[PDB]
Amino acid sequence: QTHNVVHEANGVKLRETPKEFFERQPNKGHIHDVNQYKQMYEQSIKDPQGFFGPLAKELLSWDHDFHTVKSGTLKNGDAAWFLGGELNASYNCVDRHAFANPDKPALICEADDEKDSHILTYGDLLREVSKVAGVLQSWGIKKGDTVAVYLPMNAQAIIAMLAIARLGAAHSVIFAGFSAGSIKDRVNDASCKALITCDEGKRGGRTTNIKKLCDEALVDCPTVEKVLVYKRTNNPEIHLTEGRDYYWDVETAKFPGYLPPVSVNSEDPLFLLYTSGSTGTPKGVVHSTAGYLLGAALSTKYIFDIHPEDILFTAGDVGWITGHTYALYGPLLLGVPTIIFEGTPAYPDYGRFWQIVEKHKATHFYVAPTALRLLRKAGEQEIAKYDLSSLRTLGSVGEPISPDIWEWYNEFVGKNQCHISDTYWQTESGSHLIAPLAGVVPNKPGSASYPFFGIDAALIDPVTGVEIEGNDAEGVLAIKDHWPSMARTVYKNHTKYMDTYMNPYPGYYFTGDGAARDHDGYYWIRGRVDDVVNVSGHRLSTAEIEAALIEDKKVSEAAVVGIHDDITGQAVIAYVALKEDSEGLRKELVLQVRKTIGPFAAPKSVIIVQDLPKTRSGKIMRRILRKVSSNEADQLGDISTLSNPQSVEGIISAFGAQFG
Amino acid sequence: THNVVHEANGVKLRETPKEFFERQPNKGHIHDVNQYKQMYEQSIKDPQGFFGPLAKELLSWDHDFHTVKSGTLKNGDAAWFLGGELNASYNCVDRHAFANPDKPALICEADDEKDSHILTYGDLLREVSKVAGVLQSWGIKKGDTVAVYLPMNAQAIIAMLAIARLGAAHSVIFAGFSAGSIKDRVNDASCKALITCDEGKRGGRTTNIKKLCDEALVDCPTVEKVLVYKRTNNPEIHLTEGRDYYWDVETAKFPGYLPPVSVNSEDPLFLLYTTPKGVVHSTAGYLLGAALSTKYIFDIHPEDILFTAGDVGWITGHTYALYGPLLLGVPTIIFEGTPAYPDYGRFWQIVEKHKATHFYVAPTALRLLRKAGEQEIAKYDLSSLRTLGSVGEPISPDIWEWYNEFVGKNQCHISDTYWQTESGSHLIAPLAGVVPNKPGSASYPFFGIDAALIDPVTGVEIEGNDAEGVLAIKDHWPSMARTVYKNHTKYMDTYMNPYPGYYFTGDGAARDHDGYYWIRGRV
Amino acid sequence: THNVVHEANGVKLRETPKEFFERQPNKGHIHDVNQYKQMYEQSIKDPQGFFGPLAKELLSWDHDFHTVKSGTLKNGDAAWFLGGELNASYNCVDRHAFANPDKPALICEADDEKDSHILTYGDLLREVSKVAGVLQSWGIKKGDTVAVYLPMNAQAIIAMLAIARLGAAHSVIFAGFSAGSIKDRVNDASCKALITCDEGKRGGRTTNIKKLCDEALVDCPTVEKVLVYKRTNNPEIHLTEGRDYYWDVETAKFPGYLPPVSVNSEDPLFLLYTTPKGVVHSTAGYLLGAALSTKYIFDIHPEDILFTAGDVGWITGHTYALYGPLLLGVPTIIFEGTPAYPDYGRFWQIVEKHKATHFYVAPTALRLLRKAGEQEIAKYDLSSLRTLGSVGEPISPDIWEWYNEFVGKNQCHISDTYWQTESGSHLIAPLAGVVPNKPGSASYPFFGIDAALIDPVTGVEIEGNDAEGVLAIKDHWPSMARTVYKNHTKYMDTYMNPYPGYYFTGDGAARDHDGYYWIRGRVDDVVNVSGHRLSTAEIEAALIEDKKVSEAAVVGIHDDITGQAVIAYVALEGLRKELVLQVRKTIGPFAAPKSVIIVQDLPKTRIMRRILRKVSSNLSNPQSVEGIISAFGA
């Protein structure tokens, strides 16, 4: 009843799924009740062969059957699923649905300005994906190649990804907010032979540069042989390099509306998605084909309760894993329409999300708490203008959801009639790890609830490294066996992969997160233990920001840490020591970060100090910057172990004077 | 009586002669003209249930197909037997070599009969594997294109099959093309290799073959290597070192068997140019069309011998001098010479020599033997023939009767086959021993071909019989060309955009009160 | 009593010792010699119904085959399991790793025992996947060839399987070959990559490996990249920037699983050079022969442990140190060293250490151990042994008795296995526990091997027993080599054309009244000109009897009309007619050379007829080559 460790769970009223959820459910639920979920979950752990075997044969269409469901171990980093099987991602996301119902909506595309919105059916999607795949084929793209995509969140980004996967190549989607430098680093690490981009973008009604940044990056990308450019704005002033750049519309018009998909092995790579960790350089997280697709389909169907009649609106960007799995692969695998929103939640006004839901009668809505906090602050008044009664599942992703935000989400968006799915997962997991199945698992606001099929979650004592038995516990969140959609490697750097996920806690997968498990088995995410900073849902590398600040010849040393933020969840604070206007130089360093990484990595604040605290070796002690960036300087303790203990006073004074 | 189709007024139906059935080795494939319409209507109304089983009957698959038909004419995305895999050379050679290795395959009649030979299916498999082994050794792989510039002899048939054995597309270039026309076709397809010969023989005279390639290859950088056959063995012929190699020298280095390479149903099988436009044909669709029409329009049985007096530089040789016959495991006669060499009885010496059962030629040759070789027909025995075919042109009702009595002796069936390179196989033709004939008429459309007439002025389909207009088809068919290489726009503007929802044949035709279609020529 | 096969007179048949069956883990795969003949007769008369089921039993298929057997010897187009697809590394590694990943796979005994180690099947899958991942990232793919120049250790086995995992064909180059011998083999195969090590250790001595490769690679432009294993980690071994990369550095970048690539049954699995000729073996047929012979001739069960004391540089290591044992899922002992280092007991210390049940070695090694180390054998417990194999050469009845007594303690079955590189697997051998032995005889032909004796003058088959002649085979078999790389005409001229309708082993043999075969010496020069078998050595002697000739060299070359033609080069127009009559008088009318070319001097080494053959078709004194090319044209 009472918890001594997991205080979040004390006196928390369990929240059953509202009765209206089942009234709006088009068919019988995919799972009967929570007891059937526990029985199925236990088979997915104890007998993954008999559990995932049948599900893989139901939900995916195979070109060659698989002979072995599961292989390898975490400790040896050789996980594999559905071995010997062959399939194609674009066939399972497009072809098979187009043959069955070519006129069914596939991509419900809401542009930055609604006047530019349009809907592609599955038949439309097959023809356009076939044409792009025909261009890439004519250019020499083939199984084993990588192709970069630098596109906003619109139809062309989806078509590019599916066209690449149709040939057996792996796509590497580069979020449209990345700078030229970040584009360069990602294209070169993957040795991409081609790039798919557009001339310009539309964001909040403003024209954004896209091709311009690519040209800047491509000067140092010798592997890129040809570029496909979509005329998003058709601006005649956008230059194309003769012999390298070609127009989407011109080249697709040369090839037919059907191209055979290329069968690939279950374990052939489907895509690279570069991610930021505690290292200084982005790591290309590699996902398999069959296992990743199955996880996407499984979680989308069972956690969100998706039926053929439903319509999913994932308010994410394909530049991130959320868009990968739940705006593209998840929905299209199940054959339902997915809403691809190119704009922002604030344009033309803070009701846009709800105008879209009402316009298309979306049944499922998936968004990050950062957006919920913004609409609670600036757009609560807009909600009453829209009919949101078509909704029944409300998802939350990317970061902790406050109990308060949970209630606001539940009341103002769901009218206290929808099921909320707080989905915990990460880029490397491919799909949901811990989440309340819609209509099945009752909720505790702020808790992700139970682990999903194939996810044998555990807590590890951070002092002893041994697994913690029993409930009312806390520790490092780890997973005891691999699962179908687990990332298989870091591109051309499997040693970093092993050192990051498998070697820290041998026999386990290290999520990088801490968590707690209450007496009912519900998991409560406590945050990253590895000091990875997550700003507005964007996973960031503090080391990458430190490197950017140092490129400025004026900076001698820099240290970046994360702190709580009422708006972005977390914010990065940069401490800079100069060699030697203070407000002017502070703006110069912030712009330096925007140029090298991107606008979304810029520090919320730059604190200029005379000296950083260090060890007797000379290493910077960021632990002191963290306790100061929060009002916990009284917890720094004995600092006589520092070589420069006198610097601590200046750091407390500088932070108090310059943080604002 | 007809008010529109003036060609139809007073034309007596010409039932197939009774002697056509005495010479049939087995019960015909279709009983009467009535059953043909029960099969035809199903092929229009239920293409999935009609062509699906036929595809499994006539072709051998390495991977089953999951969808029989996809796409529409309006969107130029037609596809057949999606998901399936197969290999053209396996269906034309391997599977018959295993069953009967010694059965004849290529009955080769050279320019001089003194150089005529024959290749059994066992021989053909060994010769195609060795040439394919050469190409595989050179780096030729699935997705490449290989040009052929050869006369009408064994080497051309082997070259096409060897190229398809690796899953590459062969682009055949008629041996009577100029170096310019050669350069244009090779560069459009970016062919990595070329198969030709030192020099051919056309009616006694020797023709410059390699000399024309060399003049053209100087503008074809994509060509890495050339395989040269010794048709005459002339030493004065120059082979550029490091590029040109001898057929016999390279094939001697490789074994008599090479595994075929599986290709998807919709992987291109060949480019064939008509600025020249490269007509691209799929693999499964085209092959099925070739075998179906060969089986039902000509009434080909395993015991039959087809003599298509055409050249593989054109579609007629593609479909009915190579693929059509060999898919059915029957022998086909590859004639390199001319109808006048040694004299105007060569066609008849060959028919008599090999007891050919089927003959297939264009009316252009009929007008040459009508006005020069009408007498040589009686010297030779033409009693083996059952079906006589016309192709390429409209056959004058004059020439139809001449072709019937002089060659057919009033005892054979005549089928006026109408079709284009873009159709892959026969569009409208009378079936042997099924469809009665009207001299000069193509008669009824074939399975899966939903013929229609369109008023050119309004663009609206003309209903009811006794009408004329632009000939168009209402749905795509398995052997329909899928695109024009690297130029699908020209493909849409030519065939699909003139009349959306239809296939523009480029011809004008008329349909009389009996449904018999009369081809009135190009528009 | 025998009037022809004198080896068989008074030879006591030697039954399999009772201890053999006591140590046998399960019931034997064949009950008795009577059951063996029933199976053998089906393998000859009905290979479709015999090998079909066995291929489905012993091999794992990615695509089913539609035809068990195709082609003929006469046409050199033999093929088995047509339309089938599989992967060699999947059948040797993956499927066993899934079933029991901790089962030992490669028991590796290094030159110095301190460096020995054991790889499980799970270990092997990870290491093969990683190397295959390095090669894949380098662009190696189906249809490529990859050279291996490695000692007999884990890296050689891993390299071969990693190459086969991508559908490329490996070409193993014995680590003792010189730079020149490496050059010829890499260029004939146009290998795109090479896998080697910095230095080797053999008998405690450091051998140069990379140094010889660098020397050869300067003239091997097809090699794009080299993978170098740190066997000694000698810091002075130079690596060329942009071409050479370290095994450990690159494998660390890639995951422990990589999908295998399906290949056709008849796609080449490997080239093995022997001018060196690249013997090409198929995939499906070769693997089936390896598994079949390993299982039935050696009597291999899942519980057994095989020690083939051979080198992967030769076919013996290919078939019976790697493919045979791993296909059946058993551990195989990979010995890097010599039988004398650190001492002459090493072979027996290894058998005792790992309780090997099967031992396979060539008589050359047995003679050495009998001469220098007989005393050491009794120091070790060899009671785990049950099958003793002999390969590569005749085994004397005396050496057989010594082998049987001192190694086998008169308790083991001996399998004298006759075969050759081009046969892929055993041709004639006594099945362990089934066929009783006659010392020195290979006994009965194996499944699918229709052995016969043919008269070497007429090529006609010899009926009945107590006979001797050319050992030939009447039909092809699954593991028969398919060609010589890019030189199928030499293949045909060597194996299929000398005795049309037969496969020519090059060996003589005799068949006694019990049907046992006794391998005799090698057959001499056989040139077949319009059916007349000729001896080039016999013609040279006749030309030399002419006092005008100082030296003479006769060789054979392909001929489109007469099959083969002999060309005589003479070192000293009218005299040319005098020499031809001399050959007709002393040898026979049809033995005259097609042409006699008079030269100033013949090539020699220390006669190099390999040069004369390549000249008649289009060391020491290299300048003489110019004059012979002009003389042949004159």
Ligand SMILES: C=CCOP(=O)(O)OC[C@H]1O[C@@H](n2cnc3c(N)ncnc32)[C@H](O)[C@@H]1O
């Ligand atoms: C919750 C907010 C969602 O919208 P927001 O992140 O503002 O991005 C709006 C649109 O612009 C693209 N985009 C994002 N950042 C940039 C950027 N920095 N430059 C260009 N395009 C960008 C982004 O991919 C989508 O298509």
Ligand SMILES: C=CCOP(=O)(O)OC[C@H]1O[C@@H](n2cnc3c(N)ncnc32)[C@H](O)[C@@H]1O
């Ligand atoms: C899923 C999209 C974001 O992926 P990625 O950029 O890799 O960030 C993953 C991390 O976000 C947190 N996180 C994610 N979801 C939650 C969640 N539902 N509750 C709390 N923290 C969360 C948690 O720290 C995790 O390690």
Ligand SMILES: C=CCOP(=O)(O)OC[C@H]1O[C@@H](n2cnc3c(N)ncnc32)[C@H](O)[C@@H]1O
């Ligand atoms: C159709 C009538 C038969 O005679 P004709 O086509 O003129 O030539 C017969 C033979 O010569 C080839 N051939 C055709 N035209 C030329 C030509 N112009 N140059 C070289 N060879 C040619 C043709 O492909 C076959 O192998």
Ligand SMILES: C=CCOP(=O)(O)OC[C@H]1O[C@@H](n2cnc3c(N)ncnc32)[C@H](O)[C@@H]1O
């Ligand atoms: C198939 C052989 C040659 O193909 P190709 O060179 O593309 O020419 C096809 C065209 O020739 C006419 N045509 C062809 N055959 C006939 C025919 N049998 N009757 C009337 N016109 C015909 C008709 O115009 C058609 O569109």
Ligand SMILES: C=CCOP(=O)(O)OC[C@H]1O[C@@H](n2cnc3c(N)ncnc32)[C@H](O)[C@@H]1O
């Ligand atoms: C397999 C080992 C070596 O293969 P390879 O190098 O190709 O040599 C094969 C030859 O070795 C002899 N030979 C091989 N095994 C025996 C044997 N068991 N008895 C006698 N001679 C033998 C016989 O001459 C044969 O043609």
Ligand SMILES: [Cl-]
């Ligand atoms: Cl099942």
Ligand SMILES: [Cl-]
């Ligand atoms: Cl702390």
Ligand SMILES: [Cl-]
């Ligand atoms: Cl040598």
